[PDB]
Structures are given as structure tokens and as C-alpha cells.
A paper describes a structure:
IDH1 is a highly conserved, homodimeric enzyme that reversibly converts isocitrate (ICT) to α-ketoglutarate (αKG) through NADP+-dependent oxidative decarboxylation. Tumor-driving IDH1 mutants catalyze a NADPH-dependent conversion of αKG to the oncometabolite D-2-hydroxyglutarate (D2HG), while typically ablating the conventional reaction. D2HG competitively inhibits αKG-dependent enzymes like TET2 and JmjC lysine demethylases, causing DNA and histone hypermethylation and cellular de-differentiation. We identified one mutant, R132Q, that maintained weak conventional catalytic activity, drove robust D2HG production, and was resistant to mutant IDH1 inhibitors via a mechanism not yet understood.
While R132Q:NADP(H) showed no major global structural alterations upon alignment with previously solved structures of WT:NADP(H)13 and R132H:NADP(H)30, local shifts were observed. Unsurprisingly, NADP(H)-bound R132Q had the typical open, inactive conformation seen in WT and R132H, with a larger active site cleft and smaller back cleft relative to the quaternary complexes. These distances in the binary R132Q structure more closely resembled binary WT than R132H, supportive of a more closed, catalytically competent ground state for R132Q. In particular, the clasp domain and helices proximal to the substrate and cofactor binding site were shifted, with the α1, α2, α4, α5, and α11 helices adjusted upwards and inwards in R132Q versus WT and R132H, resulting in a similar shift of the NADP(H) molecule itself in dimer-based alignments. Importantly, this inward shifting of the α1 helix is a feature of closed, catalytically competent IDH1 conformations. R132Q also contained longer, more intact β strands in the clasp domain, which plays a major role in maintaining the dimer, compared to WT and R132H. IDH1 R132Q also maintained an extensive hydrogen bonding network enveloping the NADP(H) molecule; this network was far less robust in R132H. Together, dynamic and static structural data suggested that the IDH1 R132Q active site pocket and surrounding features have greater rigidity and more defined structural features typical of fully-substrate-bound forms of IDH1, suggesting a more catalytically primed state for R132Q:NADP(H) compared to R132H:NADP(H). We now believe that the more activated, quaternary-like state of the binary R132Q:NADP(H) complex helped drive inhibitor resistance. Instead, our alignments showed residues 111-121 in the inhibitor binding pocket, which form a loop between the β4 and β5 strands, likely had a larger role in the loss of affinity towards inhibitors for R132Q.
Residue numbers in the entry:
A (entry chain A): 4 to 135, 139 to 272, 283 to 414
B (entry chain B): 3 to 134, 139 to 271, 284 to 414
The structure:
């Protein structure tokens, strides 16, 4: 077996909890031994520990640099009643993101025989937004001037901008800000992401409206690029380029994918089971990977009733491969790195060979026309993945 | 005899849409409807020659007559100023008109059974109304205080909020506002939109974060619904509900369309995107296509090259305006004609006759053959033939 090293694992809820264990038993543990720091973020354990397990897991990722998380229940009124919760606990992902900070990158796994939004997309597209509300909103009770002013610490200037003169009645108003350091982090993660995946980085803004707000982003990116990054980019045939929201969307419809897209926003096509997410810290050392979808409660309800389920494990699987990939990069572990990529290859190869779960079959043929013989159920698909994994690894040996 | 349509304000536009606009009036409207046409030429040359006076006048006419249908217009930039030697960079005509009329813009894509849509589970299009810029942004060069103050006009105590204290480094800051009247109008237009279409209404905000800012939207929407629209909504078996933006995106993706989405704050064929400005009064509306003047196709047409521009959005501007005019005047004949024009457009495409953009949505642009679509004039002639036939069969 491979010596994988230190990995922080977080267990989840409902259907993903089941798939998670299938992944560990069929795909990971037979080939990788890990110094595994496992945390049970199941809803009942989070309630029992008064959410302490969530904080402990966050600190564990901070210490060991690699975290892979299963989907978790974010409680609401119904969940509080269903589980007899003591509190409507905050989402584990919010707690973890707030402890680690960083930038989230979403990337949908592409298979040739699965329709994409843009027919021409051959390579993936990695979209990134910064994990930051810290905004001061208030009620304007009646007529009067709302103004926003800046005063430098040296007190040599004072600038006052009229936000609005309320002359008929009141309303609402707010102010919000952004620190340079937070914009710089967003850019560092974004450039390191483009270098890691070996693709070009595009930044899109709306400088035609918030000329000053978005212009600061444009400048901070260009500064960092031309300073510490331009070199590596020209080396790998990649580059950085700023785009307006229109020029960017256009360049995407005509493009073949294969680029990082940084957004200053203030999730659709392709089954949710194909979407991956990665929290990348500015330091470039810490990564937390996980599927972009949820616990799949509906499929779990079928399971509980004893009905066949067909749940896509790809996003969950790619959470492990990304985490193991980063762990291998940190440890210079060529064997683990080879495994992580082999597992990714096998998943796509199996789907592209026609073995797939119902969601993907529906994407191809349309749900009203899918037949039982068009797909595999949850356990059949995991079986096929494990079978092709064993073949692939053994064949690589020769 | 033709139908007596009444008073309509019409606004002529630029480039490709101007060509198609005239074909629409000649082939689909005028052969069947007589209008008291208040017609204004918002072509770039006429706006310049009148110093944009025509644009303001058109807005006043809509205010007076309640119904307006507008062709897409060139919004000037530096390149347009050079191309036409403009006296100056005239403001977007839509900006002038919205400023004069107020109201909320609602966007709706026209759904054809045989054109693939974003979520294949959307049977009926979804109508999205948006709010408004009005953001005072600026750069923070270095350490210092950014504060936002409220100064009452009656002399009482000034109120000051800290936005942020930049202790080291700089960044950016911005201020933003919303007047209560503005939110009330947004709600009223939205409720009227939902009643008119007979569909449910959903307001999406982030009132859990912006507790006071977005909370004001949700509160005003609810108070106006309970006092002015609850019963009417029930009398049509519809409803209004607030929803957090995340939950709303969830409900929408699993839904089959058919609802109005008001959100404070999408890639189909632009040729199928419709737009309507709905004033809160419930009387005045202005309809236009969601796309622009299609300059690229116009350059083709200028060199005598074959074009295939989609007129659907332009056609639905006319049908929505005429439908509102019919409602205002209790004009059963015009109401039917407007419905017939919309169905004939949908049916022609659903029968396999379409412009190149929709053929691309089916075969993909790389494999679109000339025999897969009609050019602009071929498609317009096909619509005319089918409209003629439908209206003949409608007598009995
Ligand atoms: N990262 C996290 O921890 C996340 C937490 N959640 C939690 O999970 C639950 C969400 O349930 P829901 O709102 O249904 O969102 P889910 O993403 O859990 O399920 C959404 C729906 O999309 C389809 N789908 C999603 N993942 C898969 C998959 N792997 N294979 C096949 N189909 C899939 C299914 O639709 P169909 O049944 O039509 O196939 C499923 O019902 C809540 O408790 C929420 O708090 C949700 C989001 C993220
Ligand atoms: N309501 C208004 O008055 C509006 C004004 N404008 C003005 O109009 C011009 C806009 O030009 P542009 O920026 O190209 O935006 P357009 O929407 O005019 O053209 C956009 C592109 O989308 C496709 N497209 C749009 N409408 C159609 C259609 N009816 N049938 C087929 N394809 C269509 C074409 O792409 P392809 O050529 O690849 O098919 C077209 O080149 C500018 O002068 C702008 O100021 C723009 C926005 C709204």
C-alpha cells in the first residue's frame, strides 16, 4: 500500500455519508494508508458536542494542510424538529471557511459523452470567488442627507460624497468596504491556481459602473502578475488577462475551456454530481476539497424505504483525489500523486465507456426516455469503479 | 375591415432592428390593425438633429397614452460619436424613458417546445423583474476612517456609522441607498405583473445578512401584499412569498417555470428575449426586445449579404403593447389578434421554420446547414402566410 501521510477527513450526513464509506472501502483504503484525522460532522454528533467537533476539524485542517469533507446537513426549522436539535447550528462549511479563509474554486468534471452547456467546451473551467459581509446597513427614518466620508489618518484631507438626499420620506442605506490585503489574497490564490492547473487566468469585472471599486481589483491583479507571476505564466504558455463581463462570457462561448475565471460577484448546467469545490488558502499550503452538492436527502429517503438509488459519487471521489493530490505535492510523494491521478482517470474512463448512474443517463437521453438498462445503481457503479481501478493500477505495474 | 387598435406610442430605432421593425409593421400589424399611431423616430441621426428632444417627447407620449412599443436604439459611445459625427455622447434613450416613467423592467424568454432551454424542466418561461446605478464608490488610498452619516432635515441629531477603520494599507469603499417610494413601486409593479399573468410572485433577498436593508424590501412587499393584493391573488389561486436567494435558486431549478421573480440585486438566444417596463400605476407599460440593434448583422446587410435575424423579440414587443392597449380599452378583437400573433410566431418555429440562431440551438453552430434555417425576409414572409391563415380560421 501507499504511504499517504496526514489527511483530515470529515464525515457527513444522509446519502453522501453512505457513498463516502463506499469510497473509502472500495477506492482508497485498499491502496492508501493514511495518518487519518477523522472527524464526525454528522448532524447528531454535531448536536451532541454542541458543534465542538466542527471547530476541532477546522483547526485540524489548519494544522495538517489537507482536508476532505463529506456533505453535511445545515439545520433549519424542519431539521431541528426532525433531529430534536438543541439549536439551529450554523453550517459547518461557514464555520470552516471562517476559520481558514481563502478562495473557493468550482470546477465541473467533463466527460466526452455527457452534454455540456457550451457544446465546444473540451477542457474544464475553474470559476473562483473570494470568501470575503462586514457591511453597515441601516434604516433612513426620514428626509435628510446620507453621506459617506473618508479621513486619512494624517488628517490632511477630508472627502465627503453625497450618497443620496432623501427629500420625500425615508428608506435604507448602507456602506461597505474592501481591504487591499483581501484583494491581494484573492489574486495570489487565483494566480497559483492557474499555475497549478497549467491554464490561463482571466479576471472579469464591471469597471463600467463601479469604476473605482472594480478598478482596484484590476490594478491589484496586474501588479501581482507583472511582479511575481508573469514569469511562470510565460513559461507554461499561460497568461493573465482582464476581461469585462461581456468580453469574458463571449470568449467562453467560443473557447474550449481550460482557464481559471476569477469573479468579483456580489452552478447550473451539468448534473450536480459532477461539480467539485476546493477552498485554497492564500498561503498556497492549505486546501480543503469537497463535492459542490449536498447530502442528497431525496435519494437517502429512497434508501431508507429500501428502494434502489442511483447517486453519483464522482464529486465526492474528486474531493479525495484533489486532497490526496495536494497532499502528494506537499510531501513530494510521487506514488500517492500517481494514485490520485489514476483514480481521476478511471472515474472519467468508466463514464465515457457507458457505465454511469441515472443522473448522467438523463443528461444524455432526457429523463422521460431513460431506461433501467441505461445506467447502474449506486452500488453497481461503485463496483465498476473499483473493478476498473484494480485493473488500471495492476496494468500500470507492467 | 381592420381592427380599431386605438392609441399606441411607437419608437423607431437603428440598424438591423430598424429594418425588421418596418417589416413587422408592413407584414404583420398594418394589414390587420388601424392605430392612432403616435410615432417617434429615435434613430441616432434624428436624436442628434433634435438634440435628443425626440427621446424626451416619446417618453411624455407614453406617459400620456399608457402604451409604448420601442425599437432598439444605438447608445452612443466614442466610436459611435465618430461614426456619426454626433454633437455629443447622447444618453441611452432607454435611460431617458425609464427616468421619465419609472417602473420595473421584466424580462421573459419565449419558450419553444423544440428549442433546448437551460433547465429542460421549464415548460413556461420565467418572468424576472429587477430593481435598478446609485452606488458612490471610491478608492481608499491609505489608513483612515470611512464613515457613513445620516443628517436629519428637521435639525435633530446627526447619526454616524463606522464603515471601517483602515489601520494599515488602503482599499475601496462604497455607499448605497434605496428610497421607500422606490421599493413600494417595485412591489406594486411586481404584484400587478403577477396578477396580469396569473402566476405566483416570489421576492428573493438576503435579509438574513443585510438585516435592515433587505429586511425593508421584504417588509414593504409583505405589507403591500396583505393590504392591497392578498384577496386578488387568492381570487386567482396564486400567491406571493418571500424567499432567501439561495432557497429561491433551489426551488427554481427544480420547478417547471411559470412564476414572477422579483430580486433586488441566463444565456438563451437574445432573439427570443422580451422586455416590458411596468409602471406601478398599473396603467402604463412600454415593451421592447431585450437585445440590441444587432450591428453585426446590419453590417452584413449593408454589403448586400444574406442575413438571418430573429424578429420574435421585436414581434412580442408589439404583441405585448397591443395586448395591454386591448386590456385598457376592453377591445376583445385586438386582444385576440395579439394572442394570435404570439401563437403564430411560436407555432412557426415549433413547425421547423426558424432563423439561423435557433437552428444553431438545435444542431450546434458548427453543423448548421443553410437548408436548416430561413433568412430574415424568408422568415418574415413565412410568419405573414401563417398569420393570414390563422386569422382566417378564427372566424369559424
Ligand atoms: N456542502 C454541504 O455540506 C451542502 C449541504 N447541503 C445540505 O444537504 C441537503 C440539501 O439537500 P438538496 O437541497 O436536495 O441539495 P442536494 O444537492 O443535497 O440534492 C439536490 C438534488 O440534486 C440532485 N443531486 C445532487 N447531488 C447528486 C448526486 N451526487 N447524484 C445524483 N443526483 C444528485 C438530486 O436531484 P434528483 O433527486 O432530481 O436527482 C438531489 O435531490 C440539506 O440538508 C442542505 O443543508 C446542501 C448543499 C451543500
Ligand atoms: N434596447 C436598446 O436600445 C439596446 C441598445 N443596444 C445598442 O445596440 C447595439 C448593440 O449591438 P450588440 O452589442 O451587438 O448587442 P446586440 O444584442 O445588438 O447583438 C448582440 C449579438 O447577439 C446576437 N443577436 C442579438 N439579437 C439577435 C437577433 N434578434 N437575431 C439573431 N441574433 C441576435 C448576434 O450575435 P451573432 O452575430 O453571433 O448572432 C448579435 O451580434 C449597440 O449600439 C448598443 O448600444 C444594445 C442593447 C439594448
Amino acid at each position: 500500500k501507499i504511504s499517504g501521510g496526514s489527511v483530515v477527513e470529515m464525515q457527513g450526513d444522509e446519502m453522501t455519508r453512505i457513498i463516502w464509506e463506499l469510497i473509502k472501502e472500495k477506492l482508497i483504503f485498499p491502496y492508501v494508508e493514511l495518518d487519518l484525522h477523522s472527524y464526525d460532522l454528522g448532524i447528531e454528533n454535531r448536536d451532541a458536542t454542541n458543534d465542538q467537533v466542527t471547530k476541532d476539524a477546522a483547526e485540524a485542517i489548519k494544522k495538517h494542510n489537507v482536508g476532505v469533507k463529506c456533505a453535511t446537513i445545515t439545520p433549519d426549522e424542519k431539521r431541528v424538529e426532525e433531529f430534536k436539535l438543541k439549536q439551529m447550528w450554523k453550517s459547518p462549511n461557514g464555520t470552516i471557511r471562517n476559520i481558514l479563509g481563502g478562495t473557493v474554486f468550482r470546477e465541473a468534471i467533463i466527460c466526452k459523452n455527457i452534454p455540456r452547456l457550451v457544446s465546444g467546451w473540451v477542457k474544464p473551467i475553474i470559476i473562483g470567488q473570494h470568501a470575503y459581509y462586514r457591511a453597515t446597513d441601516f434604516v433612513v427614518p426620514g428626509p435628510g442627507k446620507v453621506e459617506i466620508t473618508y479621513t486619512p489618518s494624517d488628517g490632511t484631507q477630508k472627502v465627503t460624497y453625497l450618497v443620496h438626499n432623501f427629500e420625500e420620506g425615508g428608506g435604507v442605506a448602507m456602506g461597505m468596504y474592501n481591504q487591499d490585503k483581501s484583494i491581494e489574497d484573492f489574486a495570489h490564490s487565483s494566480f497559483q491556481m492557474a499555475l497549478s492547473k497549467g491554464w490561463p487566468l482571466y479576471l472579469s469585472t464591471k469597471n463600467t459602473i463601479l469604476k473605482k471599486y472594480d478598478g482596484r481589483f484590476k490594478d491589484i491583479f496586474q501588479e501581482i502578475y507583472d511582479k511575481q507571476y508573469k514569469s511562470q505564466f510565460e513559461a507554461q504558455k499561460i497568461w493573465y488577462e482582464h476581461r469585462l463581463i461581456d468580453d469574458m462570457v463571449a470568449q467562453a462561448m467560443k473557447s474550449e475551456g481550460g482557464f481559471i475565471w476569477a469573479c468579483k460577484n456580489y452552478q447550473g448546467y451539468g448534473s450536480l454530481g459532477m461539480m467539485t469545490s476546493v477552498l485554497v488558502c492564500p498561503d498556497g499550503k492549505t486546501v480543503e476539497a469537497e463535492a459542490a452538492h449536498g447530502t442528497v436527502t431525496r435519494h437517502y429517503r429512497m434508501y431508507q424505504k429500501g428502494q434502489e438509488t442511483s447517486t453519483n459519487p464522482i464529486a465526492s471521489i474528486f474531493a479525495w483525489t484533489r486532497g490526496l493530490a495536494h497532499r502528494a505535492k506537499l510531501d513530494n510523494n510521487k506514488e500517492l500523486a500517481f494514485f490520485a491521478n489514476a483514480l481521476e482517470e478511471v472515474s472519467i474512463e468508466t463514464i465515457e465507456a457507458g457505465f454511469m448512474t441515472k443522473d448522467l443517463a438523463a443528461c444524455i437521453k432526457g429523463l422521460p426516455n431513460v431506461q433501467r438498462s441505461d445506467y447502474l445503481n449506486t452500488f453497481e457503479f461503485m463496483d465498476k469503479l473499483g473493478e476498473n481501478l484494480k485493473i488500471k493500477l495492476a496494468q500500470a505495474k507492467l
